[PDB]
């Protein structure tokens, strides 16, 4: 990144004020005392009306706003605490201690950063305790391009508050010192709208390491708060800390929140998992479904399934209510809607076939009327439905067209070519055969959409798409190099044939020469040596050189590259069809009306505590492997 002005500067890029910053940096105590006396006497020699203002302009930098207190804290030495006790005592007789401890940068990239923001970051618990006990602001919002970047490489976002700075830098002794302070606003929201619990989700990691202080900071702040105000708070985008963990793909944080159970009464009401009974490996629990089920707009189940930015959707959709809601919707409507979508579309491809095969060749019942009117209606049903999904779609397709958004185009292109064949055949035109045949060939080719979501057949549609997009299209630029180079080369040697006998040279034009050289590449060629040219040996040299390069080397090079794609999909094949069915379920739920979706709703009302009635889900879990390993070491 770049900021065009440093935070601290001690190297110059090629007199009372400049010596004070050169005294608080190295740690010269006896020099700093002699310099402050020279500035204490320099207040009254010309005026006594402006004492509190003139004392501040000689201790602050006029370009950044950095004070002499900030300069001592940016440069940590073992003589640091002695400098702070002198500078805070110097503002006592001048009565300027109120504005000296609450100063901030006036520069646009570090605006709002105070001396308390530096002392907590340098791990100075004794110095930060002296500032708060003197009048430092515990609610100072450090804005700016450095503290509020646009990406995670152009600064450092922690939450803009001193409570979020100690929480993100693993310092719980300062968090306990700030939460006991009665002027600290815990539920404060920064420029992003994030509170103390949104900012911990942002700095969290995606997987489980050895030390997880973010989960420890999440539990410590939430239980000492003792309310739901931090959890129901939404951002400027309208996201809770539960929904933010699903958006950014933090599976360890999303697992902890969504099965949080507190056994202690006076603290039990802050739970989302409620175990009813347990007997060995069998447990029965109640799970909160407040923002999880798809009854609100931006629900957690809708985020995780449609989150193409992240890599761990299979880890997050295996979690504790998310796998059961996804399974119960399949056994109620989504298996029925997938079977009928197969049946109405397989009947649609047969009717396209039997009107394309039995077309009126030269001369130009109730079941025949039932067939052709079904073609005109079902093609308009797809072109409206798939046309909305393309319009409601963003142009950054590198992550959505993996297996998902590729089918939204080919069902739409096939539906338009059926409709375009109607306008051509009826009016006056003969180009209907060019549109009806290509729609029928693409119509049968779209039957591989119904192989998706199954353990045995789900990986075949991914193998076809990933070979075309990642192996074949990047290999056309290697092969057209040799197809167009040798194509003009062999066509230039062919002499103009004497008048008759058009089968005297197959390479007699550039359009001819590309055809046979494509046949030598795939192996349907002919090494003809008749070939009436003035250079028979030179034609025979470039013809065999083409066969060795394309057929022997470049053809088997592509097969070795396509074979690496097939084995990579086959290793991930158990994770593919589980994510294919998960998107198929939620698209079928959006096709349902409101009166029918209300019958399909899961959940029952519970009595958690006094004035607490939330929507639950009873999930009977049995864990044999986790039980046998648990019992074994209690009696080793």
Ligand X SMILES: CCCCCCCC/C=C\CCCCCCCC(=O)O[C@@H](COC(=O)CCCCCCCCCCCCCCC)COP(=O)([O-])OCC[N+](C)(C)C
Ligand Y SMILES: CCCCC/C=C\C/C=C\C/C=C/C/C=C\CCCC(=O)O
Ligand Z SMILES: NCCOB(c1ccccc1)c1ccccc1
- List the one residue from 341, 349, 532, 573 that touches ligand Z (CB under 6 A): 341
Distances (CA, A) of 542 to 249, 469, 506: 56, 31, 15
Scan residues 405-434 and list those touching ligand Y (CB under 6 A). Answer: 410, 413
- Using the structure block, give the residue that is written with the tokens 């729609």: 439
CA dist 411 and 445 (Å) reads 10
Residue 17 in the binding site for ligand Z (CB under 6 A): no
Supply the minimum distance, in Å, between the C-beta of residue 196 and its own copies.
Answer: 18
Tokens 């400027």 sit on residue = 236
Give the footprint of ligand X on residues 377-436 (CB under 6 A). Answer: 381, 413, 431, 434-435
Stretch that binds ligand Y, among 384-392, 428-436, 460-468, 569-577 (CB under 6 A): 460-468
Backbone CA torsion sign across 51, 112, 15, 18: positive
- Rounded to whole angstroms, the Cα distance separating 433 from 374 reads 19
Q: Using CB distances below 5 to 8 A depending on partner kind, what does residue 35 bind out of ligand X, ligand Z, its own copies, none?
A: none
Q: Which of residues 276-305 bind its own copies (CB under 8 A)?
A: 276-277, 279-282, 284, 286
Q: Which does 465 bind (CB under 5 to 8 A by kind): its own copies, ligand Z, ligand Y, none?
A: ligand Y
| Rounded Cα distance, 437 and 474, in Å | 29
Closest CB 457 distance from ligand Y, rounded Å: 10
Residue whose pair of structure tokens reads 């697992």 in the numeric block: 255
CA angle, corner 235, sides to 232 and 239, nearest 5? 65
Bridge-based pairing state of the strands 273-279 and 282-287: antiparallel
Question: What is the per-residue DSSP string for 379-417?
Answer: HHHHHHHHHHHHHSS-S-TTSSTTTTTTHHHHHHHHHHH
d(CA 109, CA 532): 77
Contact partner at residue 169 from ligand Z, ligand Y, its own copies, none, CB < 5 to 8 Å by partner kind: its own copies
In whole angstroms, give the CA distance from residue 401 to residue 387. Answer: 16
The minimum distance between CB 86 and its own copies, in angstroms, equals: 22
Out of 361, 394, 502, 590, the only residue in the binding site for its own copies (CB under 8 A) is 361
User: What are the start-end ranges of the H helices in 94-195?
Assistant: 97-100, 115-121, 125-132, 162-168, 172-179
What is the contact mask toward ligand X in residues 322 to 351, using x (rule: CB under 6 A)? Answer: ---------xxx-xxxxx--xx--xx--xx
Sole binder of ligand Z in the list 314, 583, 597, 614 (CB under 6 A): 314
Q: Does 456 bind ligand X (CB under 6 A)?
A: no
- The answer to whether residue 400 forms part of the interface with ligand Y (CB under 6 A) is no
- By the rule CB under 6 A, 591 interacts with ligand X: yes
Nearer to ligand X, 549 or 566 (CB): 549
> With helix as H, strand as E and coil as C, how does 24-52 read?
HCCCCHHHHHHHHHHHHCCCCCCCCCCHH
Rounded distance between C-alpha atoms, residue 528 and residue 515, angstroms: 14
Q: Which of residues 469-488 bind ligand X (CB under 6 A)?
A: 472-473, 475-477, 479-481, 484, 488
Stretch that binds ligand X, among 89-97, 115-123, 217-225, 439-447 (CB under 6 A): 439-447
Strand (E) or helix (H) holding 272: none
Q: Binding partner of residue 461 among ligand X, ligand Y, ligand Z, none, CB under 5 to 8 Å per kind?
A: ligand Y
The annotation status of 249 as a binding-site residue, yes or no, is: no
The residue within the footprint of ligand Z, chosen from 103, 257, 289, 317 (CB under 6 A), is 317
Contacts of 83 (CB under 8 A, 6+ apart): 24, 27, 29, 32, 72
Subset of residues 400 to 419 that bind ligand Z, contact rule: CB under 6 A: 411
Contact present, 614 and 600 (Cβ < 8 Å): no
Catalog residues that contact ligand Z under the rule CB under 6 A.
314, 317-318, 323, 326-327, 330, 337, 340-341, 344, 381-382, 385, 411, 578-579, 581-582, 591
Which amino acids are annotated as binding site for Na(+), given as ranges?
A: 523
Name the site residues for ligand X (rule: CB under 6 A).
331-333, 335-339, 342-343, 346-347, 350-351, 353-355, 357-358, 367-368, 371, 381, 413, 431, 434-435, 438, 441-442, 445, 447, 450-451, 457, 468, 472-473, 475-477, 479-481, 484, 488, 509-512, 514-515, 518, 521-522, 529, 535-538, 540-541, 544-545, 548-549, 552, 555, 558, 591
């Amino acid at each position: 990144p770049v900021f065009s002005k440093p935070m601290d500067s001690n190297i110059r890029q090629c007199r009372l004020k400049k010596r004070i910053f050169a005294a608080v940096s190295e740690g010269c105590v006896e020099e700093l005392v002699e310099l402050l006396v020279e500035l204490q006497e320099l207040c009254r020699r010309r005026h006594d009306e402006d004492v509190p203002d003139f004392l501040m302009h000689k201790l602050t930098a006029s370009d950044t706003g950095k004070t002499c207190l900030m300069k001592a804290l940016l440069n940590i030495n073992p003589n640091t605490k002695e400098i702070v006790r002198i500078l805070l005592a110097f503002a006592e007789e001048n009565d300027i201690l109120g504005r000296f401890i609450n100063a901030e940068y006036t520069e646009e990239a570090y605006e709002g950063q105070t001396a308390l923001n530096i002392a907590i970051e340098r791990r100075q618990g004794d110095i930060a305790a002296l500032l708060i006990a003197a009048g430092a602001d515990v609610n100072a919002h450090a804005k700016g391009a450095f503290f509020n970047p646009k990406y995670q490489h152009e600064g450092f976002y922690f939450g803009e508050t001193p409570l979020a700075l100690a929480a993100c830098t693993n310092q719980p002794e300062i968090v306990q010192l700030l939460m006991e302070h009665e002027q600290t606003d815990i539920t404060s929201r920064d420029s992003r709208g994030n509170n103390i619990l949104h900012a911990l989700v942002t700095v969290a990691e995606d997987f489980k390491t050895q030390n997880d202080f973010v989960k420890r900071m999440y539990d410590m702040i939430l239980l000492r708060s003792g309310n739901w105000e931090l959890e129901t708070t939404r951002n400027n985008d309208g996201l809770t800390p539960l929904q933010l963990a699903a958006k950014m793909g933090k599976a360890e944080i999303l697992k902890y929140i969504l099965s949080r159970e507190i056994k202690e009464k006076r603290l039990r009401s802050l739970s989302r998992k409620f175990t009813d009974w347990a007997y060995g490996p069998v447990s029965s629990s109640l799970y909160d479904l407040t923002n999880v089920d798809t009854t609100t707009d931006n629900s957690v189940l809708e985020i995780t399934v449609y989150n193409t930015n992240i890599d761990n959707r299979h880890e997050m959709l295996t979690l504790e209510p998310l796998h059961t809601l996804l399974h119960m919707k399949w056994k109620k409507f989504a298996k029925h809607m997938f079977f009928l979508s197969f049946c109405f579309y397989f009947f649609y491809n047969i009717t396209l076939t039997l009107v394309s095969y039995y077309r009126p060749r030269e001369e130009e019942g109730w079941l025949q009327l039932l067939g052709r009117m079904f073609v005109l209606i079902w093609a308009m049903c797809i072109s409206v439905k798939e046309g909305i999904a393309i319009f409601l779609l963003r142009p950054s397709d590198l992550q959505s067209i993996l297996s998902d958004a590729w089918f939204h185009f080919v069902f739409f292109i096939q539906a338009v070519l059926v409709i375009l064949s109607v306008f051509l055949y009826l009016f006056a035109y003969k180009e209907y055969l060019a549109c009806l045949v290509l729609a029928m060939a693409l119509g049968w080719a779209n039957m591989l959409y119904y192989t998706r979501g199954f353990q045995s057949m789900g990986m075949y549609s991914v193998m076809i798409q990933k070979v075309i997009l990642h192996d074949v299209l990047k290999f056309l630029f290697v092969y057209i190099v040799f197809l167009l180079g040798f194509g003009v080369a062999l066509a230039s040697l062919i002499e103009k044939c004497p008048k008759d006998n058009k089968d005297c040279s197959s390479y007699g034009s550039f359009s001819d020469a590309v055809l046979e050289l494509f046949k030598l590449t795939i192996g349907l060629g002919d090494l003809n040596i008749q070939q009436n040219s003035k250079y028979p040996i030179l034609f025979l040299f470039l013809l065999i050189t083409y066969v060795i390069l394309t057929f022997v080397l470049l053809l088997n090079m592509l097969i070795a590259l396509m074979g690496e794609t097939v084995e990579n999909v086959s290793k991930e094949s158990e994770r593919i069809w589980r994510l294919q069915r998960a998107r198929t379920i939620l698209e079928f739920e959006k096709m349902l009306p409101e009166w029918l979706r209300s019958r399909f709703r899961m959940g029952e009302l519970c009595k958690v505590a006094e004035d607490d009635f939330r929507l639950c889900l009873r999930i009977n879990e049995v864990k044999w492997t986790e039980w046998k390993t648990h019992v074994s070491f209690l009696n080793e």
